């Protein structure tokens, strides 16, 4: 019997800062126990200061990104070159996903950018289109390894101020872009150690008011 789905592995991570946002992902592509590519880009600049990644089954992932990029193009044609805001992009992606409710895109989608007040924004989707704005979200193979670490080191969960013994929480102070990138790199380094599908390379797309910048880092290739 023909199975229309597959699993290309990969892990992605989106974090929203005060006036910035990052969307990162490893560059390894796999089937079963084989490596297809050590460098296959997974996070894409979609225009209008929006970055996107659809992790899971790569064929569905490529199809969705391609259709969203197309939706941005037609949004410009139909509405006098108006900039597609991140909230509007998120609602649009819901309809793209729910359109195939009974034959779903087998992916976990994350988009990142800035909202209309210039504040950092990350949105997270399930395969059939349910979505939410979030501060922090890992997706894919090693998501279960990364999220607890982020709960602890970004949101300071289970951390209290010394001397008070559980009475006063550690205050939620804002993180810089340099600080966030450190946590992203350590997240993927740790995931590379303990998850076989994670490795080769890490590509990070950073979004600010100035535009979209890229950073690349080597990961272990075993």
């Amino acid at each position: 019997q023909f199975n229309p789905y597959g699993d290309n592995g990969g892990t992605i991570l989106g974090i929203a800062g005060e006036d910035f946002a990052v969307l990162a992902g490893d560059t390894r592509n796999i089937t079963d126990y084989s490596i297809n590519s050590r460098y296959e880009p997974k996070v894409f600049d979609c225009g209008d200061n929006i970055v996107m990644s659809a992790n899971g089954f790569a064929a569905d992932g490529d199809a969705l990104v391609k259709r969203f990029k197309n939706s941005v193009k037609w949004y410009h044609f139909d509405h006098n070159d108006k900039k597609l805001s991140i909230n509007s992009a998120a609602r649009n992606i819901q309809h793209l996903l729910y359109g195939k409710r009974f034959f779903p895109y087998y992916v976990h989608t994350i988009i990142a950018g800035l909202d209309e007040d210039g504040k950092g924004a990350v949105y997270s989707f399930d395969p059939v289109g349910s979505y939410e704005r979030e501060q922090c979200r890992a997706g894919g193979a090693a998501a279960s390894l990364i999220m607890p670490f982020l709960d602890n080191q970004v949101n300071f969960k289970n951390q209290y101020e010394p001397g008070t013994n559980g009475k006063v929480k550690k205050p939620l102070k804002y993180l810089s872009v340099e600080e966030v990138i450190k946590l992203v790199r350590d997240s993927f380094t740790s995931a590379t150690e303990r998850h076989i599908q994670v490795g080769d390379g890490l590509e990070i797309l950073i979004v600010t008011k100035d535009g979209v910048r890229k950073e690349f880092y080597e990961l272990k290739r075993d």
Binding site: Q94, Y98, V128, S130, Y131, E132, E134
Partner: protein
């Protein structure tokens, strides 16, 4: 998942938890399980997250079209029936929905309809849906009165979700409260279950089984 809604003297209380799971894995603790259909109507999320989100936003669009055409606020009866008739068309295809459509109009007063993906549409005073529904029902049934104050009713809904969050493994995170009046719903905050549990334990004297 635990969601509830009940009618009382001062309108409707809606209370939900915030947890979403994929198997044993806790996907999110910050899920918005009350869908703001419009400033006067609320819907609750249980079963399929997308099915509830998508079709209740769609419901908001239909309600907006109704009041543009008829120059009058849509009834809770009519709004709930638009949704139930829609999901009935899809029956068999695999939609998953268990929701309370909540509103307060002039002609009806405070009204709640339980709508469900196999086509069920039930009017009622108290409804509770989700994996932790049985726990919340216990607190509701033993403490509910029509003549509850808005303050006490809000607490009752909060306390009932807490009961479910404690015992049901797939319920937790935080509690979202809403109070539905004739002039529209009012949001009454996000309440972390971790902090709420200890606060309630001390002030109420409950949960003596748990060491704090």
């Amino acid at each position: 998942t635990t969601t509830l809604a009940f009618r009382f003297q001062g309108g409707i209380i809606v209370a939900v938890d915030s947890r979403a799971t994929a198997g044993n894995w806790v996907a999110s603790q910050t899920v918005k399980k009350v869908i703001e259909i419009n400033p006067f109507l609320l819907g609750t999320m249980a079963g399929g997250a997308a099915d509830c989100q998508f079709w209740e936003t769609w419901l908001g669009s239909q309600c907006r079209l109704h009041e543009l055409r008829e120059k009058e606020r849509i009834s809770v009866a009519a709004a709930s029936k638009i949704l139930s008739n829609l999901v009935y068309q899809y029956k068999g295809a695999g939609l998953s929905m268990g929701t309370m459509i909540c509103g307060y109009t002039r002609k009806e007063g405070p009204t709640i309809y339980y709508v469900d993906s196999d086509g069920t549409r039930l009017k009622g005073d108290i409804f509770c849906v989700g994996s932790g529904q049985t726990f919340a029902y216990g607190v509701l049934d033993s403490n509910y009165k029509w003549d509850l104050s808005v303050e006490d009713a809000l607490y009752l809904g909060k306390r009932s979700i807490l009961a479910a969050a404690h015992r049901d493994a797939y319920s937790g995170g935080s509690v979202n409260l809403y109070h539905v009046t004739e002039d529209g719903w009012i949001y009454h905050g996000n309440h972390d279950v971790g902090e709420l549990f200890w606060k309630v334990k001390e002030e109420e004297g409950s949960f003596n089984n748990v060491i704090g």
